[model samples]
Target: SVLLTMIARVADGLPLAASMQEDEQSGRDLQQYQSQAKQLFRKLNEQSPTRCTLEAGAMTFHYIIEQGVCYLVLCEAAFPKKLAFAYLEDLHSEFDEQHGKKVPTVSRPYSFIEFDTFIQKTKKLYI
Candidate 1:
């Protein structure tokens, strides 16, 4: 299952948007991974690899950086890599086309929270 998705600016680590899957049992523990995702955002820099994956116990994190924005998704370890990256690519184009110009000017976290609407819609297609 796709657990969570987060978008952030690579330059300043400002969160752009995000969505998390909701399941009764796992919902409580997901906050731990969510914090880790935010921490990863804070650590992003120009030198960071454009595409990377990190294993986290039973789950995994897959992310891609493009044109200064980073899109990341947490998924079950068994989820295929091909599908994970494809999902990020789909998000990249839509996000860049819609808010590419505004990314640099935004200062607050979740500056594009409305984008979650798109995130959720796209997530459904992948899962």
Candidate 2:
């Protein structure tokens, strides 16, 4: 299951855009997703957390840092790590080509909201 897919500006740990897979369990998952993403992003900041895997309960987080920003995706723990990283990799490629030059100049949150569309499209391809 795809819990959350977000592109964050690592410089400020701010979420620029995100996408989610809708499911029956939607009451608290959104908040939990944000909390988890923030927690991992902060730790990423403290360490040389460029490319890494984070296990959180029943989920696994795969993140790739490029151009000082992070592309993060949360997937079911049982999912293959290879696929997860591949998922991020697909996103990383498009991100660099389309938005790499503008991420640093972003002065507000969710400026790349349109990217949420890409998240959904790419996730389906990789998954």
Candidate 3:
């Protein structure tokens, strides 16, 4: 399972795009966790703003801070951190290439959710 993986606009830290079973049918607990992840990513930027790792509950959060966005993913405690950054770096390149120009102008949350299509397509490489 992928826990929660997402890309957010740094301007507001709202989920501009994400990868997950994001819907009402997926269960509210997951939805709330994602919401919390969004806030956590944003707060990380506010508090320090750098590439780093954090712990929440039993999961590990690995994030990459870039000029426009912060790439974040949640994994099991035993998941390889090396591979985790590799995953984020892989995501960061494509996301920035495609969404870089859009992040600054997006006006609402999940405006770039369509990119979930790419998210679904890309992570197959890591798993």
Per-candidate clashes, comma-separated: 0, 0, 0
lDDT of 1 by residue, 28-99 (tens): 567888889878988988789999999988889999999899999998899998899999999999999999
Q: Which tens-of-lDDT digit does each residue in 1-127 have in candidate 2?
A: 6647888888788778888656565658778987878876676664666888888888888888988788888888988888888888888888878898998898988888887888788877866
Q: Give a tens-digit lDDT track for model 3, residues 1-127.
A: 4636877766677677777663343476577667777677656545565677887766788888786687888777778889889888878888888878778887888898777877777777776
Error of 2 at 66 (Å): 1.0
Which residue pairs of candidate 3 clash? none
On the 0 to 100 scale, the lDDT of residue 13 in model 1 is: 80
**Pick by TM-score: which candidate is best?**
1
Candidate lDDT values, in order: 0.88, 0.80, 0.74
- Preferred candidate (lDDT higher): 2 or 3: 2
Which portions of model 2 show Cα errors greater than 4 Å?
none
TM per candidate: 0.92, 0.89, 0.82
Candidate 1 regions exceeding 4 Å error are 25-28
